[PDB]
Structures are given as C-alpha cells and as structure tokens.
Symmetry: C3
Subunit: 486 residues, 3 copies
C-alpha cells in the first residue's frame, strides 16, 4: 500500500462544495485565547493606576509619579478617579487623542509676569499634603487686595517645534463668590494667535454637590507653531498656564483595560491581554496596538495540510507530497488588502445643563419675555436637533464598520475553502496518477483492492520494494508463480 | 454508449472562464414572481383600510374598529386619510416605529383630576355620529366660565412595565380665539419625569384652509419606566391624556402596500405580495417581513445539476452520478454572512412655515429691528444648513446601501459560477475516468467513436451488458470474430 | 517532442496557491502610463485659459471669447484668476455643478424696467477697455439723483424650458459709502417664485485690500420652471440680472488640470491626460470623463495566456491550444457590477469673518450687553459645531470610498489569480492527456525522457510525424530494430 497510515482523530475543514469533510492533520488559523496579562517588553507600557491621561497632564496630587514620564502605550484603568477641583473639558476626546499620539509629558516651565494679581489660588478639595492646594501646571490668579486689572500677556515661539498651551476658566456658584474672587461682576477670556481666537465668558450657576463644591472649571487648549505669537487677554475667571509641553509625532496611543502586567515578551497588546502573532487572524477583540493578526468574526478557520482519512486499516510503504509552504502565500493576498480602523474620534459633546438666559424683566415680563423664552427654546430645539444628527452619524458609522467586517470574514472563509478544495484535489490527483504509473510498472503481479492500494498475490523481499520505489521493475521473477495461479 | 440521453431544450449557466455553456437540466435560484396577494395565515395581518397607525392610535371616529387590536404586522394603504382635527407630529417617524414594534393597541384608562377646567372640547371637523366631537384617547380642556388655573398633575408608575403617555398643544389662528378658549394671552406646556422635561409654547399664526380650520394641534409623547413619576404643568393650549398604552417588545413592524388579502399560508410578506421561501435569493423587493430569501440585483442565477449537452443522437446504457445535495451546503456560506438592512429611521423634519418673531417696533423699527431681522435670518440660515446636512447624510446613507448590494450580488454570481465550473469538471472527470476503466476492461472488442461512446464491432445479449456493468468481463467469446475482422 | 519551444524571458503571474510562477507569454491588464496631453477629438474640449467656469458665466472682461460657447467638457487651469470686482458665492460648489452639467452658455437677454434708478454702475478694478466698467450679464443699479425707490419687478415663464436667473447683493466698507450709493442706511433683497423666497440684508464691514477695494459682492441664483413667475423686491444694494441662461441636461461636466491639448483621437480624459481604453482597469487617477477602464490600486495585474516555461532546451513538433477569447468573458463579470463614484458635492461653506452684532449700548453696556455677547458666542459655538459635524461627514465619506476601492481591488486580484490557476490547470491537463494518448498510439517505439517529451530510439521521415499527427500509426516498420535492441 501507500495508504497514508490512517491518522487517528483528524478533524473537519470547510470546502466550497462538500462541508465537514475530514483530513489527516489540520492547522488552526484564528488565535482565539488570551493569558489575561500585558508583557513589560519590548514596548514601554505605563500603568495609570488611579489616574487618567488628562489627570496626569494637569498634575493630580496623587499622580506626581508621572512627571516627565515616557510611554510607548498608555493604559487607563476603570478604578481611576479625580481627587482635586471638579473640572470640565469641551471636546474632551480631541485633546486626549493629541496627548496620546505624542508619547511624552515633558513640561517646560516659562516666565509669565502676572502684575496686579495674587498667584497660587488654594482649594480644600485638592489639599496638597496637609494644607490647601491645586493642580501643578496651572496658576489660579485672584484679585490682589481690591483690584483685578486686564491681564494682557504675549509669548513669541522662536524655536523649531510646536508648543501646547493648556488654560481654563472658572464657573462660580453665586455672583457674591464671583465678586469675592474677581472685583468685576462678569469675566471674559480671549486667547489669540496670528491664525485663531477663542473668547469665552463665565456661566454663573448652581450645580450638584461634588466633594463639597458647586463651582466648576472648563479646560481649553491652543497650539502655537514655530514663528507665531500668543496673546492672552482677560478681566476675571482665568486659570493661567505656567509653561508648554514638548510635542512630537510617531507611533504612540492609549487603550482602556483591567489586565495585570507580567515579565514576558509580546508586541501585540489588546484589552483582553497579550496575543502571540503566529496566526494570520484573531477573534479576541478589534482594537490592536503593535503588530497583530487582522480581526474576523468566526471561532475556527481550519486550513488543511494533507489527505482525507480514507481507510479501514493501515499498511506500510512510500508516500507522496505534503502541503508545505502554501500558507504564507495566500496569507499575502488578504493581509495586503485589509485596512486599519477609522478611529471613533468626535464621540459627542454630552452636555447636561439648562443654558438659558437669566433676568425676570427680560425672560418672564412682557413681549420681551416671550421673545427671550422663544430664543432659549429655539436654541434647545437646535441642541436636540444637533444631538439627533450626531447620533444618526455615529449610528451610520457603526453600520459601515459592521458591514466591512462581515464582508472581509466572508472573503476569508471563501479563501480558506478554495485552498482546501484545491489542496484536496492536488494531493488526490498526485496519488491517483502515481498509483496507476505504479500499475503500468507492475506488469500484472498485483491488483488494487479498491482503496488506492495493491493486493500483492506473491511475496518479495525489500529489494522488490526498492525496485518499485525507483520505478526500475521486471516481472520475470514471478512468471512461474503467476502462470500456475492463472 | 453512456451518452447522457441528449435531453432536449436544456439551458445556459455562467462559468468563470466560458460563458453561456449549456447543461442537461438546470435549476433557477431567484424567485422573481408574485401572485399580488397577502395570505391571512400563519401571521396575524391587520388591514388599516382607511387609517394609518397614528390615526388608529389617536382614535379616529371611522377607525373605532381597531380598539384593543392585536397585529403581528401592520399594513398601511395609500387611500387612507384623516377625517378629524388637522394635526402635526414633530419627529413623526420615531413615534410610529415605537408603536409599530410593540404589536398592540391595549389602552388602559387612568384617573386624572382636572380642577377649574371644562372637559370634552368639541370640533365640527371631527363630528362623532351626528353632533360635534374629537379623538377618543385625548381630553381637550378649555376655560371653566372665565378662569383657567395652572394644571399641575402627577402620576407615579408603581407596576412592572413602562407606560406610553400621548399628549399635545393647540396652535390658534388669532389671539382673539386664543383668549376665547384660554383667558391667558399665551400658553406653556411642561412635561417632566425624574430624567427629562419638554417645555413648548403655542405659535399663533394663520395656515391654509383644511376641512374649514386654520388652527393646528402638535402631538408629543413621553415614556415613563417602572419606579418613575410624571408631572404635567400648563397654563393653556393643552391636549391632556386619559390613560397609557401597555408596551411590549418582540417581532412586530409595519409595511406600506396596495395588495389584496387571501386565504393561503405564507410567512414571507413583501409590498408586491406573498413569496414562497424555497429559493435562496429573491429579486422582488428589498423590504421583507418574516423569513425570506436575501435580495440580489439580477433576474436569473442558474445553478447547474448535471452534464453539458454533447451529442448528435442518443444510445442506451448505464450512467454515473447527479449533483444531488450540493445546493444547501453552498447556500450555507452566503446565507450565514449576509446582513439585515439598516432601517431609514430619522427621515427628515420636513417643516414648511415662516417661524420668525412678531412685533412692528421689535422687528421693523430702529437698530432693534435690524438685530431681530438679523436673528430670524440667522435661524433661517441655520435651518437651511441643517436641511443641507441631513440631506447629505441621507444621500450618503443611500450610497452605502447601494454599494453593499452590488458587492453581495457580485459575490453571489461568482459563487454560482465557481460551483457550476467545479460541477462540470467533477462530472466530466468521473465520466472520462469510468469510460477508460471500461476501455481497459474491453480487451479490444469495441473502440470509442470520439463522443465518449464505444462503437461495438460485434453483437452480444444483455448478459454482456451486465458483465460490463459489474466490471467482470473476458474477451474469449469474441476471439474468432475479432481474428477474422483483423 | 511537443515541448512548447522554451520562449525566452517570459514573466510572473499570481496564482491562488503558488506565487510568482512563470508563463510563456503574458498580458498586462492595467494601462498605467500617460502621454500628458488631451486630444481635441472626438469630444468638444474647451480650454478656460485664464478663467474659471463662474468667471465665464458672469462675463469677465478678459473672457468675452467664451460668449455663447458650447462644451462637451470644461477644463479649469490653476493659473486662472479674476480681474474684476472681488466677489463671493455662498454654496459655490452647487451653482458650478449646475452650470457644468448643462454644457452651454447661451445667454438670452430680457426686457427689465428699472424706474427711478441709474443703470450701468462702474468700477476701476473692472476697467472694460480704457475706462471704468463691470461684468457683462449684470446691472449695478444706484440712486438716480437723490432717491432710490423699492424696485418691484415681475416676469412670467410662458415657454417650454426652465430659466436660470443670476443676481447678487453689495456689501459696503462704511455706512457713508452705503448712503452715497443708496439713500437708505440699510438694504434688503427679496427674490420669490410660487415655491420659494430668499431675503438677504447687507453686512457693512471692512475687509482686506484686494486690487484696491475693501467692499464685496455676494452672488445668488434662482431656478424658474415653465408656468411660474418671479418677483424681485429691493430697497438698495442690488445687482440686477439682464436675462436668463437656457438650461439643458445630458452628459456634460468639468475637470481641473494643467495638461496641454493635441490633435489625436481619444474618448477617455483624465487630469494626467488621454488614456487608450483597450485595458479593463487603469491606475492613473480616479476621476474619468467619457468611457474609461475602472480604477484599481495596484501597478500590474498579469493575466496569463499559455504554458509554464518547463525546459532545459527546445525540440520541434506539433502543440495544443492557446487561451484565446477568455479575457472578455471574465471582463464581463467585474465590469458589470463595479459602480460610478459618489460625487463630492457639498464640500464646505468655508466662511472666514467675524459676523457678530454691532452697537456699543447693545453689546458692551449693561445686562443687554451680556445677553447680546452671549448670543453671538452661542452662534460662534453653533458655527464651530457645524464645521466639526460637516468635517466628520466628509471624513466618513472618504473612509467609505477608500474601503470600496480596496475591496474591489482585492476581488480583481482574486479573479485574475483564479483564471490563471484554471488556465494553467486546463493547458497542463490537455497536454498530459494528449501525450499519453500518443503513448498508447506509440506501441513501444519511443519513451518519455521525463519532461513531457518522447525520446525516440529509431529515426523516421516526416511520413511518421504526419501518421502521429493524425493518430493513424502501426509499429510493424520498426519491429526488426526494436527486437534487435531488446
Ligand atoms: C522634568 O523635566 C524638566 C525639563 O527637562 C526635561 O525633562 C528632563 C527629565 C530631561 O529629559 C530634559 O532634557 C528635558 O528638557 C527638568 O528640568 C531640567 O532641570 C535642570 C535643573 O534645573 C535644568 O538644568 C538647568 O539648565 C539651565 C539652562 O541651561 C541652566 O541655566 C541651569 O543653571 C541648569 O543647569 C534642565 O535644563 C531642565 N531641562 C530643560 C528645561 O532643559 C526637571 O528636572 C524634570 N524633573 C521633574 C519636574 O521631575
Ligand atoms: C379594551 O381594553 C380594555 C382594557 O382591557 C384590556 O383589553 C382587553 C380586551 C383585555 O385584553 C384585558 O385583559 C386588557 O387589560 C377593556 O377594559 C376592561 O374592561 C372590563 C370591564 O370594565 C374590566 O373589568 C373590570 O375590572 C376592574 C378591576 O378588577 C373591576 O373593578 C371592575 O368591576 C371590572 O370587573 C377589565 O378589567 C378591563 N381590563 C383591564 C383594565 O384590566 C375594554 O373592555 C376593552 N374594549 C374596548 C374599549 O373595546
Ligand atoms: C449670442 O447668443 C445670442 C442669442 O442667440 C443664441 O445664440 C446664438 C449663437 C444662436 O445659437 C441662437 O439660436 C441662440 O438663440 C445671439 O442673439 C441673436 O441675435 C440675433 C441678432 O440680433 C437675433 O436675431 C433677431 O431675432 C429677433 C426675434 O425674431 C428679431 O426680432 C430681430 O429682428 C433679429 O432677427 C437672434 O434671434 C438672437 N438669438 C435669439 C435670441 O434667438 C447673439 O448674436 C450671440 N452672440 C454673441 C453675444 O456673441
Ligand atoms: C475582552 O474584554 C472586552 C472588554 O470587557 C470584552 O468586551 C465585551 O464583550 C461583550 C460581548 O458580549 C459585550 O457585551 C455586549 O455588548 C454589546 C455592544 O457591543 C451590547 O449591545 C450588549 O448589551 C452587551 O453589553 C461588552 O459590551 C464588551 N465590553 C466592552 C466593549 O467594554 C470582550 O468580550 C473580552 N473578550 C474576551 C475574549 O474575553
Ligand atoms: C413592487 O411594488 C413597489 C412599490 O410600488 C415597486 O417599487 C417601484 O419600483 C420602480 C422601479 O422602476 C420605482 O421607479 C423608479 O424609482 C426610482 C427610485 O428608486 C426613481 O429614481 C425613478 O424615477 C422611478 O420612480 C418606483 O419608485 C418604486 N416605487 C416605490 C418604491 O414605491 C416595485 O417595482 C414592485 N415590484 C414588482 C416586481 O412589481
Ligand atoms: C495625476 O495628476 C494628479 C494631480 O496633480 C496627481 O495627483 C496627486 O497625487 C499625489 C500622490 O502622491 C498626491 O500627493 C499626496 O496626496 C495625499 C492625499 O491624497 C496627501 O495626504 C499627501 O500629503 C500628498 O499630498 C497629490 O495630492 C495629488 N494631487 C492632486 C489630487 O491634485 C497624480 O499623482 C498624477 N498621476 C500621475 C500618474 O502622474
Ligand atoms: C500536524 O501539523 C502540525 C503543523 O503545525 C505539525 O506541527 C509541527 O510539529 C513539529 C514537531 O513534530 C514542530 O517542529 C513544528 O514546528 C510544528 N509546526 C509546523 C510548522 O510544522 C505536527 O507535527 C503535524 N503532526 C503530524 C502527525 O504530522
Ligand atoms: C495688549 O497686548 C497686545 C499684544 O501684546 C498689545 O499690542 C501691541 O502693542 C505694542 C505697543 O503699542 C505694539 O508695538 C505691538 O505692535 C502690538 N502688537 C499687536 C500684535 O497688536 C496691546 O498694546 C496691549 N494692549 C494693552 C491695552 O495693553
Ligand atoms: C430537472 O431538475 C429538477 C430539479 O427541481 C427536477 O425536479 C424534480 O421533479 C420531481 C418529479 O419528476 C419532483 O419529485 C422533485 O421534487 C423535483 N425537485 C427536485 C428537488 O428534484 C426535474 O425532475 C429534473 N428533470 C429531469 C428531466 O431530470
Ligand atoms: C406642582 O407639582 C409638584 C409635583 O406634584 C409639586 O411638588 C410637590 O409638592 C409637595 C407638597 O409641597 C411635596 O410634598 C413634594 O415633594 C413635591 N414633589 C416634587 C417632585 O417636587 C408642587 O408643589 C406643585 N406646585 C403647585 C404650585 O401646586
Ligand atoms: C504574446 O501575446 C500577445 C498578446 O497581445 C501577442 O500580441 C499580438 O501580436 C500580434 C502580432 O504578432 C498582433 O497582430 C496582435 O494584435 C497582438 N495582440 C493579440 C490580441 O494577440 C504576441 O504576439 C504574443 N507573442 C508570442 C511570442 O506569442
Ligand atoms: C409688488 O409686486 C407684486 C407682484 O408683481 C404686486 O402684486 C400684484 O399686484 C397686482 C395689482 O394689484 C395684482 O393684480 C396681482 O395679483 C398681484 N400679484 C401678486 C403675485 O401678488 C404688488 O402689487 C407690488 N407691490 C407694489 C407696492 O408695487
Ligand atoms: C480518539 O478518538 C476515539 C474515537 O473513538 C476516542 O474514543 C478516543 O477517546 C480519542 N482520543 C483518546 C483520548 O483516546
Ligand atoms: C424545443 O426546442 C426546439 C428547438 O428547435 C423547438 O423547435 C421546440 O419548439 C422546443 N419546444 C417545443 C415547444 O416543441
Ligand atoms: C533575456 O534574458 C536574459 C537572461 O539571462 C538576459 O541576459 C537578456 O539580456 C534578456 N534580453 C536581452 C536584452 O538580451
């Protein structure tokens, strides 16, 4: 025989035509399993134990261990929180993705001149050590005695890099508190380059008790390029900077997870943990930092590497080829043409307040009342329409993505099936051709029993088997025996 | 011969390489035809003869036959209209899809206390029977004598289901009419849970004559969950509820069509009618309630089940295999991975009015004039920009969808072609191999004429044909004849 | 032998399983190269040498050579500019695509009656010949002495086509200039059909020095259909029309490029130049006017048309088939189902101005101040949110498109590979079958050396080669020789 030795407990592979045909020895192609831990090499992984990237940026009193810290990849934990002044970031997502892509928190201190104000404002919700305090990159300027002049400061950017400037605005709870910190009964912050300006004004209002405060701080940012100048004008409710952060650009990012940290080596990091990158595809999660297999939607793709399992029982002899190299060639096609994700970036504004106008005569007395009421309602209408729209965009965004994955997974399944069908037909044809080549060489001594194996009527020593293996055979030795049988 | 019996008037199938090759007996794979009628089983189909789902909800006087009605699927007719008070629904589409997905109009009456108002407001455009009337789920409260107090009512939800509350607001034609129904010269409706509030105000204005009215009613809804409370405040122009509708969730929906209703059995309902679900794909329409074949863009996919049609003429004998099972296996691949549609939901607002401010001093006299004019124009700008945006979204939405269908149809065509090519090669190979197996058995008695059939030189009775069929043949019987011919 | 004659310097083709296998004679399938020039036949190509389509429309003094000009395709140059009054078009893109799709600039003059105004306003930035001038389709009406009445004019459309009416509004630099041209200290333009109205008001403001003017003109359009009427009301800052343009619809468009113009014939025009349309796919650019090959992302797809290159050395004889027709059949599949692009249309508004309210008492004094300030900031907020949204839409738009191309290119690569694999297997099988048919005919005279060629032991004249070619051979002639060798 050449009967492929009846390998026990082989497995299923999909083909284009038949389904669940069985093969001698199969390979899996979707690494579906995770240890649950992130290696500490060869990447530089940084554990934000109880802070977020924003809180390390601002300088939280319990994250002063992250100062001038250098990451390849930032990991946020869910068990993180703020233990400082309660704050707010309009377009939070955009700021975070900028800081994330930089890969550094190198903070370079600068010489600002705050004439006619008191520096280093204190809070009891951000006690640094035993006494009152605040964030470590920001200066909370208040009135110096009983005056607050218009802070008008300038800084040219003369160097060969871009500077990132972080600033904000204070929202009081009552007008009394407003006057107590800032002599003027309303504030204004103007931040200008040669290419942009943002003017914001405080919104005095009561908000829920959070760590014993009903006031809030809104955080804004500005990006100055080599050759530009920045000009900060204000007349109250200003949180000044004390420097700029050095920007780079490259391969750096951020991933949210609750996985531990180990001492292995792995380059392929997901929120489920480390994945060996041997396989072409992985089913574990979509987000992949480093170099990773692409994402399919299925649990098993079995790529076949040898024969169907034909027999009742084994018989020794020579045999033909094995699938060998073919795996990386096909891998080439689909690897080449698959994409990288479009990154959910905008998310949403997610505002939760009544932002109407405030005066009894203006809003609830006379024709003017109705107008102002109508204006606020019109804006509410606008806001709700806006949310509807943004939601619809994000819904569509999801649909596109899901469509993509499906179609690629269908392609992947078809391709595996095509290879297995071809592979089966290749090996089958080779065996059949070789067997009948042997039949023409046999010269009537033996006959196939029907399972692609020759029933030999006579015996012969290993010399005959060698002669068959080299295709140099003559039938004279068995002439007398065959004639007697015939 | 084994000449496959020359089946007359076979048909075309697509292959990957050749086109319009012909086969013995072909199958169609796209059920393209409709009776035009909807079966009344096994689904519960409800015919909205002259009402829409919204009109059955509100309680139209000529659709009181739909009270506590239970549908699996709702069908709207185009010949439907309203014969009651002219009305308006902001975000009409959202409300309808909610009611549609429920599958019920179980209306549970509740005990509201309307102090200091007159109940059961009348209209001559909604005459119930012979005298004036209104909708059957709503209470039109008006002034009781010469007073209208602030209606402030509360209802806790103590049960184990969510309640759907339907309410509205009255838009008069003139301020005189406003004062005649409501002592206050302006109205306001505040509807609040622990999780939301909507404050709307009437827009006094003249609108086109519709069934003898220039006034309009705007319809709004609120969704209260187990444990919550609702608080309705108003000071005029209020259309109160009289209860809540019991919500479910499951498999229920709505489809617009002008098809009749029969007494067959069919589970696959489209706006063209009932479709048998035998086939894998259908070309009839995209929307499909129940279990239906997927949608392709082509008129015929012919999947092949047997040989090419080779001969000049027939000759009897045995023959080999037929395609058999293969159809459901491949069906598996593409069924598995195809998607369900993303449902056009938002559509558009589709507002058609001038919604500007109104005062001669405020809008057309002085600097104030210019400001107010500028504000209204700015809002008009906003509205038009909004429409542009929404339109662009919906345009893109269409493009995505069309792209999807094409790509899937291309996949479907490729897959059918792959199977037919393989199928042809499978059968062809089997015949050729079997024929030459027979040739080696023949031992020189007959010779192939060139059409995969043996020209036999001698005659022989059915014994010889049986001996050939079982592959147990010897040539001794025809030795003398063959020698004489040779 | 039948050894396929060892064709020197054949090339690579991709297969599904093996990669970079070699074939005798290969064909390329992506026309990747351009001359750099646009043919002047058979299409009517029009060269906008120093004007854009908008500037030819308005009647620029240096593009009076484009009057009643007829194009199949419009080409804009980058070296084009305006040398007339500085202007502005809100939704510039929409207007341009309308004019582009028409294919004509037939301007039909009409009889307007401008009572109580002075016609033919002059500018020194649009000097026509040696003296002051303006655009050639528009009438700049100013005050006649010391009065400016309300221009209220009407025109019914009684004909069997739609009319395109082009008009505008003047934005001054100072109120003094406003009063000097228009007695009223503010203007207003109302343009109404039975189906729409646009009321715009001038925005007095200083803007950058452009060719010695700080004033600007905003250009608007209106589309009147057969049976309608148009009514233009104004009280200042109005740029009147002098006629309508005849609309068509068909196959006409616009393409931006810096290519020269030749005297060849080509129907397939891209911004890189003319492309012969022989091939199925092209890699040159995406935009294609006329009939063109579809766009793939790859540099070479090699479709195979004959054998692998097997030998050490050649030997003469007959041979089998060649690939022939197969190319257009497969071309059919993918041509059929590919799409045409979704046309970037909206682009963006791209506004660059501070459009706030203006009064010292209204904006910077008292509670009113804060309100007005808040309103302008709220609108700025709205504008920025709008831009964010539009940007996100256009970003997504890009992503969809890129996804599409990839997936199609992957399909194209797979299809080429499938054909080449099949083609190789087809030819290989045919040769092998024919060779062993010849072996059974040989009757022991010759034996294959191992390269699909027969080593012949004896000699024989061309008679033997003919006898082999027709399959009518007997071994008697070589009996004595073979017996002696044996
Ligand atoms: C946090 O980072 C700051 C800034 O330095 C930056 O981060 C460091 C870790 C390194 O990566 C630096 O290359 C990088 O710029 C550290 O500030 C550094 O402090 C020293 C001591 O004050 C500075 O030396 C001074 O240099 C000036 C300028 O020549 C002299 O005039 C002084 O006499 C003195 O020699 C050093 O230059 C400064 N780095 C900068 C601005 O170049 C800081 O120590 C570091 N650690 C913290 C806060 O944890
Ligand atoms: C429309 O529906 C209402 C509400 O009932 C609901 O729909 C029915 C068709 C059934 O599906 C009900 O299970 C479902 O809740 C019908 O109202 C029903 O009316 C009867 C008679 O008034 C009520 O019986 C009363 O029950 C109360 C509470 O125990 C007693 O105090 C009374 O003495 C009396 O026995 C019945 O409970 C009520 N269903 C409800 C609220 O449970 C209504 O008849 C029906 N038909 C219409 C309008 O066409
Ligand atoms: C630019 O185009 C205008 C309008 O004509 C249009 O374009 C032409 C090139 C042709 O394609 C026309 O078929 C097309 O309508 C040209 O105006 C044409 O001018 C002549 C001479 O004034 C008009 O003839 C008159 O017709 C009227 C109406 O019957 C008589 O009352 C007059 O006595 C006279 O015969 C001709 O009709 C008019 N075309 C129109 C409106 O039908 C213009 O010459 C041309 N060239 C420019 C500006 O370069
Ligand atoms: C790896 O860790 C991630 C993060 O915990 C796991 O993601 C989670 O996967 C489950 C799948 O059932 C998600 O549940 C469902 O999500 C859908 C929306 O995607 C929602 O409609 C359902 O109601 C349900 O919540 C879960 O949200 C998701 N969590 C995330 C994204 O934070 C993932 O399963 C883990 N994988 C492995 C192999 O451990
Ligand atoms: C089943 O019934 C539906 C509903 O009547 C039929 O749908 C209709 O199909 C035609 C196809 O020509 C549509 O006409 C064209 O629609 C496109 C937009 O899709 C438009 O650009 C063209 O100007 C033209 O109107 C028609 O709109 C569409 N009607 C709908 C959706 O209500 C369908 O053809 C019927 N199918 C069969 C097999 O009877
Ligand atoms: C045909 O002419 C067009 C127009 O000049 C050429 O298009 C240009 O192609 C290059 C490719 O490198 C583009 O450069 C890159 O574009 C991307 C965005 O697509 C941008 O992110 C990169 O920073 C870089 O600018 C270039 O923009 C593009 N120009 C256009 C569209 O006007 C095209 O290459 C020419 N083709 C041939 C074969 O000559
Ligand atoms: C079945 O196929 C797998 C393919 O992974 C074979 O696994 C190899 O096993 C040898 C040791 O026997 C390792 O040195 C190789 O690295 C493994 N991988 C590869 C790439 O071949 C396995 O041996 C096969 N089993 C049988 C019975 O043939
Ligand atoms: C507020 O700040 C700006 C920028 O620092 C000042 O404008 C500069 O004023 C100086 C002195 O007159 C000029 O030499 C510069 O050319 C100005 N620069 C720019 C960019 O305008 C402005 O004077 C300051 N205003 C006040 C009231 O202090
Ligand atoms: C051609 O193929 C069709 C396949 O649908 C055959 O149709 C079958 O016909 C028999 C009766 O002759 C029915 O009992 C089957 O249910 C039909 N369907 C299937 C699934 O086979 C048809 O008979 C074939 N015709 C010929 C001449 O072979
Ligand atoms: C309007 O309605 C609300 C809710 O029913 C009333 O608020 C409740 O008032 C009672 C009596 O003072 C309190 O016990 C409740 O705690 C209040 N509930 C809530 C949710 O606020 C309110 O008093 C009513 N106002 C008027 C003027 O009648
Ligand atoms: C290799 O294939 C190409 C296919 O384009 C052959 O090109 C043909 O060449 C002849 C002249 O020899 C022209 O008349 C044809 O129009 C060409 N095109 C086609 C469609 O066949 C080329 O001759 C082939 N070379 C060899 C050596 O066989
Ligand atoms: C401004 O123009 C409109 C339209 O030309 C005038 O309205 C028409 O007036 C005439 C005379 O009274 C009527 O016969 C028409 O029926 C009106 N048409 C429409 C569409 O309203 C209007 O009179 C003009 N106003 C002024 C002040 O001149
Ligand atoms: C291998 O397969 C046989 C099938 O009968 C099964 O009984 C056996 O348990 C398998 N493997 C082992 C664990 O012996
Ligand atoms: C079957 O095909 C033949 C082709 O010649 C045609 O004449 C005949 O009409 C067909 N069917 C019938 C209706 O006889
Ligand atoms: C053909 O291929 C051979 C490979 O050795 C190369 O040397 C030769 O230069 C090629 N063509 C020509 C230019 O002679």
């Amino acid at each position: 025989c050449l009967g492929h030795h009846a390998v026990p407990n082989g497995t299923l592979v999909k083909t284009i035509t038949d389904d669940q045909i069985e093969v001698t020895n199969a390979t899996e192609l979707v690494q579906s399993s995770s240890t649950g831990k992130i290696c500490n090499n060869p990447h530089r992984i940084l554990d934000g134990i109880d802070c977020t990237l924003i809180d390390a940026l601002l300088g939280d009193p319990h994250c002063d261990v992250f100062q001038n810290e250098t990451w390849d990849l930032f990991v946020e934990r869910s068990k993180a929180f703020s233990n400082c002044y309660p704050y707010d970031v309009p377009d939070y997502a955009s700021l975070r993705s900028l800081v994330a892509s930089s890969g550094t928190l190198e903070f370079i201190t600068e010489g600002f001149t705050w004439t006619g104000v008191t520096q280093n404002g204190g809070s009891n919700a951000c006690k640094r050590g035993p006494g009152s305090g605040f964030f470590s990159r920001l200066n909370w300027l208040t009135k110096s005695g009983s005056t607050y002049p218009v802070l008008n400061v300038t800084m040219p950017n003369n160097d060969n890099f871009d500077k990132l400037y972080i600033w904000g605005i204070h929202h009081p709870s009552t007008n009394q508190e407003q006057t107590s910190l800032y002599v003027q009964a309303s504030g204004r912050v103007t931040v200008s380059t040669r290419r942009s300006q943002q003017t914001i004004i405080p919104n005095i209002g009561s908000r829920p008790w959070v760590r014993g405060l009903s006031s809030r701080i809104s955080i804004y940012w500005t990006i100055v390029k080599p050759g530009d100048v920045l000009v900060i004008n204000s007349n109250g409710n200003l949180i000044a900077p004390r420097g700029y952060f050095k920007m780079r650009t490259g391969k750096s990012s951020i991933m949210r997870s609750d996985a531990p940290i180990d001492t292995c080596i792995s380059e392929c990091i997901t929120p489920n943990g480390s994945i060996p990158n041997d396989k072409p595809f992985q089913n574990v999660n979509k987000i992949t930092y480093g170099a990773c297999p692409k994402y399919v939607k299925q649990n098993t793709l079995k790529l076949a590497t040898g024969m169907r399992n034909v027999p009742e029982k084994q018989t020794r002899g020579l045999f033909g080829a094995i699938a060998g190299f073919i795996e990386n060639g096909w891998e080439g096609m689909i690897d080449g043409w698959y994409g990288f994700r479009h990154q959910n970036s905008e998310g949403t504004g997610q505002a939760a307040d009544l932002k109407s106008t405030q005066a009894a005569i203006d809003q609830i007395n006379g024709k003017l009342n109705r107008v102002i009421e109508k204006t606020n309602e019109k804006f509410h209408q606008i806001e709700k329409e806006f949310s509807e729209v943004e939601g619809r965009i994000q819904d569509l965004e999801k649909y596109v993505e899901d469509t993509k994955i499906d179609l690629w997974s269908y392609n992947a399944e078809l391709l595996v099936a095509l290879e297995n069908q071809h592979t089966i037909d290749l090996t089958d044809s080779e065996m059949n051709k070789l067997f009948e080549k042997t039949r023409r060489q046999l010269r009537e001594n033996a006959e196939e029993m029907g399972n692609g194996c020759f029933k030999i009527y006579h015996k012969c020593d290993n010399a005959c088997i060698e002669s068959i293996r080299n295709g140099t055979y003559d039938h004279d030795v068995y002439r007398d025996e065959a004639l007697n049988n015939r």
